[PDB]
């Protein structure tokens with residue numbers, strides 16, 4: 001287990017990720033790297049709990065100095081960001097498949113009291129058999145514990161993926177914030193466009209969404225079956241907004257498309 005660091009796979013904010021190949025067995029891994037001088041104990045801890053085929057497999061960590069090394073699964077397929085052609089998206093049969101695995105993944109976390117708080121195509125990586133993994137638990141947090149649900153109030157994410165409640169309320173439920181970002185990943189995948197800067201009332205493109213002006217981009221690039229689902233996801237009232245159990249019922253979600 002003396003790995004050589006090869007290519008830089010990217011840095012969200014917290015630290016740099018390298019591909020690391022093992023000298024002797026050649027097992028490829030991803031090493032996240034974080035300089036605790038130039039929140040992060042919590043990422044390790046959350047990664048210790050996780051075990052699903054749609055979450056990036058945590059392998060371990062060694063401190064060894066000022067740096068912190070996370071040993072994570074390797075997604076040779078890279079980010080879902082790159083399967084989205086800008087302004088067109090990707091074929092509807094693959095869009096669905098990745099949404100099935102996103103939904104799978106998120107059910108799992110949400111079922112173990114964990115919310116990601118940054119679902120976005122750059123944090124959905126694809127492996128060798130093109131399976132979607134949820135990555136980066138830097139902004140993750142427990143919302144349910146001892147079967148008590150706690151509200152989050154701390155604002156974090158990426159504006160275009162964030163839910164309105166999070167701009168407009170002082171505390172909010174964690175599940176709906178992740179269903180929203182899942183809905184915006186579905187928009188991205190099907191239209192290849194983010195629909196708005198951020199879901200504020202001050203924003204034309206969002207005001208048009210609440211006004212059901214579905215004749216505009218990026219909504220006119222989407223078929224009425226997945227478009228119906230989206231209407232149910234980007235509801236502005238998180239108690240009105242569809243749940244994951246009920247997205248599993250949606251017509252588009254169960255429409256046969258993918259071989």
Ligand SMILES: Nc1ncnc2[nH]cnc12
Pocket residue numbers: 009010017030056072073074075076078125135
């Ligand atoms: N686990 C991972 N696999 C591939 N690319 C990554 N970039 C960040 N984490 C990664």
